[PDB]
Design a protein around this ligand. Structure first.
Ligand SMILES: [Mg+2]
Ligand SMILES: [Mg+2]
Ligand SMILES: [Mg+2]
Ligand SMILES: [Mg+2]
Ligand SMILES: [Mg+2]
Ligand SMILES: [Mg+2]
Ligand SMILES: [Mg+2]
Ligand SMILES: [Mg+2]
Ligand SMILES: [Mg+2]
Ligand SMILES: [Mg+2]
Ligand SMILES: [Mg+2]
Ligand SMILES: [Mg+2]
Ligand SMILES: [Mg+2]
Ligand SMILES: [Mg+2]
Ligand SMILES: [Mg+2]
Ligand SMILES: [Mg+2]
Ligand SMILES: [Mg+2]
Ligand SMILES: [Mg+2]
Lengths: 53, 62, 106, 252, 220, 104
RNA sequence: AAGUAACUUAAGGAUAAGAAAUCAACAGAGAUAUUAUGAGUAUUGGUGAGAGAAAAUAAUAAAGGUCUAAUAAGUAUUAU
RNA sequence: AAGUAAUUAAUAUUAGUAAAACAAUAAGUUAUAAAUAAAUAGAAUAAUAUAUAUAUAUAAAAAAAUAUAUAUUU
RNA sequence: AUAAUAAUAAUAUGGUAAUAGAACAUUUAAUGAUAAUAUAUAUUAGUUAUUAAUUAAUAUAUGUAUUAAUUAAAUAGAGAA
């Protein structure tokens, strides 16, 4: 997980790390959450407006 | 803070979720009356629900 | 004794997101003194008796359904599961029966 | 035959990564118990804790002058009858424009509310768990525990900056710069930060002081539910986190 | 965003307080729930003021007296002890008696034991413990149940200080380097009670010195 | 030994300083002028022939004695025989029961 | 209501109190002073209105004990 | 320009904990047993009251009143 | 076995004293994007079953809401002294 984080550039949260039991699961998570935001910066999650569409 | 009505405390004692009291009319002038009839007034009596609230307010720590 | 144990002794199944505890399963933790958390409660000025069941982890609906299956004699209607605190209220003083049902597993 | 088929045993340990400070680098995992760091998020308990804390915090300095406090004479301004005007007493009445306030408060106004200790502990746990879920709970340590990856050369295991007090070349100092660099790295310049130390980290607070409006460095003992929840990312020492867990554990 | 701007109380916790004297459609309009024009409307009569009739704290005669010499024991039923034993909370080494201090330690009795403990018999049927008990006193039925179980009761005298010392001997040691000595029964009634074999009083059961001294005095 | 002595409570230490154990103080009441005059007893003044009150008033004396008992330094204090106070186990043992207890 | 308001007099940075002719109860404690529990309990009242302790356990608190008196008489006590 | 505050008591609703709660320094308050003016009395001898506990009464019952009992204490 | 919305059938919906339930305006505290193409206040005309808010135009201010929302509270609403 540390290696994955280092290569990625991004931080996978502690809870997520605890949950995900396989490399495949980790990959799937990454594809879901970080990837789309990385692709499109307007699509990214903002803190002050968490319920944005 | 609130305090107990001492006269009321003297008159009334606790009995679970009610108060018990002595009967009125058995301190003098008893002669002439029937003794059996008088025996009704010798014991104690539970508080009537009409004045239960009043009693509670008088005796906050009971 | 130690609050956080070492990394070696902790197994994988002990961690969160393992063994599938969320999906349609539950637990009912005993009290500090070591008794089943099932209590009589006398609401509305002693007029409304109800049996409360506390300390439920996981799916409460499933647990309720299981209890109903165990105790068919209690009606279906009288099983109010409050979701905010996760506790399941029953109408009668049905404490002892509930305890009996739970004891075997919890 | 099978009485409670869907009964099962819950998970009991969540892994939190133990990091080196200046650069948040994974050194080890540490399994903290699920009750501290992964409780179900009960909002009502959290609310109770917050409101109580707010009530405790109150100064309560409202001190408007009542008709006694207000400083007019006690004299009757116009005689009761034979004036051709409404009846008046002294000039202090709430009814009149210069008079004192009706039902006036008098400072200090005690706004202190109570909470059960257990409830408060539960709330404290709950807030921490919520923070962990968010991905806003950075556990820094490695001194006591057995490591996997070794600590970096320029980082350190405690939550502090080195040679902060030293300032020889220019008025600018190194610990501040390091802090700024750290902020730049993890993209939390304007965000609220909450550094839960164990012992007094003087250099850290000095480094912070530039960003005092957003960064709050607190001890292990004086940290609050409010402080934890307000924070955009908490930075807790492993030892401090252990202590908190011990404090707010349900007793057996 | 932080949770701090989205916290509510639990449903059913809070209420809106009834706010008076604030417009007609509010409900609590001009009169503000007071009614109309009386003493209660603008002033204060007492809640229990009965009008002038002889009140319910005057009609009736005053009854009884407060026995200041009374010292109410906390009651412990055999049933509770049995339950504790079943639960495996009744931790006793062989020979060690279940004394009032011991009960407190275990959590059999809980809250402040000011004057003592009486052992009552509410689960005398299912009581089967051969352990030895010791309290301020016991019910006759309770005693009989204990005897049947193969147990052994002893009613033991304790002045309030002596009781306190018994409950928490370490405190006294900490303060003064010495636990205080247990007093003799000075009172006549107390002496009489513990001199009874039927009560299983300690003065007869242990064959005390005080009782012997009294007997000698009587003789002489 | 010196360190242990120093570790003794304050009042006891003060007493030892101002009435030291080298002097064998009297068991009985004495002249106030005497060197061996017991501070716990009421000593008579030789000229006036009036009993002076004890140098250590009764409470203070009792406290001192209890301190000595605690640290096992009783015999170095001067004797409390003719002061009517007994203490603890000795008091318990030596006392006669009241007339009311023995003969109701 | 209240030994309150008020008037009068006198002192000090504070004053007052303070090292038991004290409490307690046959076991014991050990200056003062303030607060919490004890407790609106005991106690008391045209037994109405109402008034209401102490012991004990906690804090706060300072080194907290220490002679300065030839050990105290119109004093204790009694009556009123 | 007008139902406010403080110290208390009783109800209710929810939430925490639960045969315990609050508090953890001990101490205390409430609960855990019902009575009785008060006293050294106090809940199935073999089961629902027809048993038991207390107060009146008594040799002990009966009698009035309230309370206690039909894997798990409330 | 819930919630929201919408159907159908039925019953109910005058109200002083009073009781109960649910909202809104205002001000402060906690959390908090955004921005002169914006925000606030005012006027006029529209809109939403409408004490309220919103749209447009016009005016004046301000490089800007302790803003929306949830909580906590109130010197929280005036034709009646
Ligand atoms: Mg007749
Ligand atoms: Mg509040
Ligand atoms: Mg109306
Ligand atoms: Mg009117
Ligand atoms: Mg009227
Ligand atoms: Mg009349
Ligand atoms: Mg007076
Ligand atoms: Mg005066
Ligand atoms: Mg002075
Ligand atoms: Mg007091
Ligand atoms: Mg003298
Ligand atoms: Mg003298
Ligand atoms: Mg006189
Ligand atoms: Mg009799
Ligand atoms: Mg209507
Ligand atoms: Mg106003
Ligand atoms: Mg106006
Ligand atoms: Mg109008």
């Amino acid at each position: 997980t540390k290696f994955l984080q280092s290569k990625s550039g991004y931080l996978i949260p502690d809870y997520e790390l605890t949950t995900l039991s396989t490399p495949l699961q980790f990959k799937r998570y990454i594809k879901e959450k970080i990837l789309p935001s990385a692709n499109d910066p307007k699509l990214a999650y903002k803190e002050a407006e968490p319920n944005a569409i | 803070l609130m305090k107990t009505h001492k006269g009321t405390a003297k008159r009334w004692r606790r009995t679970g979720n009610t108060f018990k009291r002595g009967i009125a009319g058995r301190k003098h002038g008893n002669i002439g009356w029937s003794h059996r009839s008088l025996k009704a007034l010798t014991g104690r009596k539970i508080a009537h629900p009409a004045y239960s609230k009043h009693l509670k307010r008088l005796l906050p720590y009971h | 004794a130690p609050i956080f144990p070492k990394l070696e002794d902790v197994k994988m199944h002990e961690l969160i997101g393992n063994n599938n505890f969320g999906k349609k399963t539950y637990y009912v933790e005993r009290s500090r003194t070591g008794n089943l958390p099932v209590y009589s409660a006398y609401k509305n000025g002693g007029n409304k008796i109800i049996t409360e069941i506390r300390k439920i982890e996981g799916d409460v609906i499933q647990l309720r359904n299981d209890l109903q299956e165990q105790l068919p004699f209690i009606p279906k209607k009288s099983w109010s599961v409050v979701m905010q605190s996760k506790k399941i209220i029953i109408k009668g003083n049905a404490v002892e029966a509930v305890k009996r049902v739970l004891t075997k597993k919890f | 035959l099978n009485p409670l088929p869907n009964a099962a045993i819950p998970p009991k340990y969540a892994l939190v990564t133990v990091r080196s400070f200046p650069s948040l680098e994974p050194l080890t995992f540490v399994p903290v118990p699920t009750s501290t760091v992964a409780a179900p998020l009960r909002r009502d308990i959290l609310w109770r804790a917050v409101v109580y804390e707010n009530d405790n915090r109150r100064v309560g300095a409202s001190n408007p002058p009542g008709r006694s406090e207000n400083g007019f004479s006690r004299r009757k301004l116009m005689p009761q009858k034979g004036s051709g005007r409404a009846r008046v007493g002294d000039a202090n009445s709430p009814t009149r424009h210069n008079g004192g306030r009706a039902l006036a408060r008098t400072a200090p106004n005690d706004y202190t509310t109570e909470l059960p200790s257990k409830v408060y502990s539960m709330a404290f746990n709950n807030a921490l768990s919520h923070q962990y879920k968010s991905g806003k709970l950075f556990v820094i340590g490695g001194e006591k525990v057995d490591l996997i990856s070794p600590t970096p050369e320029l980082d350190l295991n405690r939550l502090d900056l080195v040679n902060t007090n030293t300032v020889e070349g220019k008025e600018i100092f190194e610990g501040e710069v390091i802090f700024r660099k750290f902020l730049e790295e993890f993209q939390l310049k304007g965000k609220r930060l909450l550094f839960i130390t164990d012992k007094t980290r003087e250099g850290l607070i000095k480094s912070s002081d530039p960003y005092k409006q957003k960064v709050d460095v607190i001890q292990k003992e004086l940290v609050e539910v409010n402080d934890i929840l307000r924070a955009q990312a908490v930075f807790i020492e492993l030892e401090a986190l252990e202590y908190l867990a011990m404090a707010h554990q349900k007793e057996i | 965003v932080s949770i701090l701007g989205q916290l509510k109380p639990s449903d059913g916790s809070t209420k809106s307080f009834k706010r008076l004297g604030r417009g007609p459609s509010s409900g609590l309009g001009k009169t503000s729930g007071r009614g109309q024009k009386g003493q209660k409307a603008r002033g204060k009569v007492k809640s229990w003021f009965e009008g002038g009739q002889t009140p319910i704290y005057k009609l009736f005669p005053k009854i009884g007296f407060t026995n200041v010499g009374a010292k109410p024991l906390k009651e412990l039923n055999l049933k509770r002890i049995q339950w504790f034993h079943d639960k495996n909370r009744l931790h006793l080494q062989p020979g060690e008696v279940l004394d009032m201090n011991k009960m407190r330690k275990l959590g059999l009795v809980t809250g402040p034991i000011k004057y003592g403990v009486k052992i009552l018999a509410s689960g005398k049927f299912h009581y089967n413990l051969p352990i030895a008990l010791e309290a301020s006193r016991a019910s006759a039925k309770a005693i009989a149940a204990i005897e049947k179980a193969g147990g052994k009761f002893t009613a033991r005298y304790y002045t309030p200080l002596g009781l306190r010392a018994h409950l928490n001997p370490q405190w006294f040691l900490e303060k003064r380097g010495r636990v205080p000595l247990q007093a003799r029964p000075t009172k006549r009634r107390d002496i009489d009670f513990y001199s009874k074999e039927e009560k299983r009083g300690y003065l007869v059961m242990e064959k005390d010195k005080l009782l012997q001294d009294i007997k000698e005095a009587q003789n002489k | 030994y010196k360190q242990y002595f120093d570790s003794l409570p304050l009042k006891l230490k003060s007493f030892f300083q101002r009435y030291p154990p080298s002097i064998k103080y009297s068991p009985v009441s004495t002249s106030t002028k005497a060197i061996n005059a017991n501070p716990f007893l009421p000593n008579k003044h030789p000229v006036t022939q009036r009993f002076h009150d004890p140098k250590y008033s009764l409470r203070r004396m009792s406290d001192v004695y209890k301190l000595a008992l605690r640290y096992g330094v009783e015999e170095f204090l001067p004797p409390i025989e003719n002061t009517k106070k007994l203490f603890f186990e000795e008091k318990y043992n030596k006392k006669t029961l009241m007339k009311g207890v023995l003969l109701p």
